[PDB]
Amino acid sequence: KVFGRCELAAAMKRHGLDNYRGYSLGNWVCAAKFESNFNTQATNRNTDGSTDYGILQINSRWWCNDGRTPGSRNLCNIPCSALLSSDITASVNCAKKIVSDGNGMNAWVAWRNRCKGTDVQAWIRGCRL
């Protein structure tokens, strides 16, 4: 599913991401914009053989099992394919564990390079929340 900006902001808010670990909603929307263009079906293979999945491009290296990432972990206890669902629950629930992992949203390299330190509130401006 490809979400509209405000539609995903509302879904993210409902699932508890607004100010989760201190990150206002626009940070979550901005990260999703640049990680997947708001497409729950996005996937992207990494050079080490791991794959990123979903609206927040969660990596199989640590967080989910895809049966093809040698030596990886499944810290979120879920098959990576669950992160591609039109239902964002798993992506949100696993992103909550990642952002609680000590590095905050720096875990998402696109957030660090394209959202951090910017006016992220613009990503939810105008949305009914």
In the block, which residue shows the tokens 């394209």? Answer: 114
Site stretch for Na ion (CB under 5 A), options 9-17, 22-30, 32-40, 56-64? 56-64
Which H or E run includes 5?
Answer: helix 5-14
Nearest to 107 by CA among 61, 47, 68: 61
Residues that bind Cl ion (CB under 5 A): 69, 104
Q: Is 59 in the site for Na ion (CB under 5 A)?
A: no
**104 touches, from Na ion, Cl ion, none (C-beta below 5 to 8 Å by class):** Cl ion
Q: Considering the complex, what minimum distance in angstroms separates the CB of residue 33 from Cl ion?
A: 20
Minimum distance from residue 67 beta carbon to Cl ion (Å):
5
Please identify which residue in the block is written with the tokens 């992207």: 44
Question: Is 35 one of the annotated active-site residues of the chain?
Answer: yes
Interacting partner of 51 out of Na ion, Cl ion, none (Cβ under 5 to 8 A depending on kind): none
Q: Per CB under 5 A, does 72 bind Na ion? A: yes
Contact 31, 105 (CB under 8 A): yes
**Pairing status of strand 58-59 against strand 51-53:** antiparallel
Query: Do 42 and 50 contact (CB within 8 A), yes or no?
Result: no
3-state secondary structure of 79: strand
Q: Is 119 a catalytic residue?
A: no
Task: Give the 3-state secondary structure of residue 58.
Answer: strand
Identity of the residue, 23 or 53, whose beta carbon is nearer to Na ion in the bound complex = 53
101 is in an annotated binding site: yes
**Catalytic annotation, residues:** 35, 52
Would you tell me which residues interact with Na ion (CB under 5 A)?
60, 65, 69, 72, 74
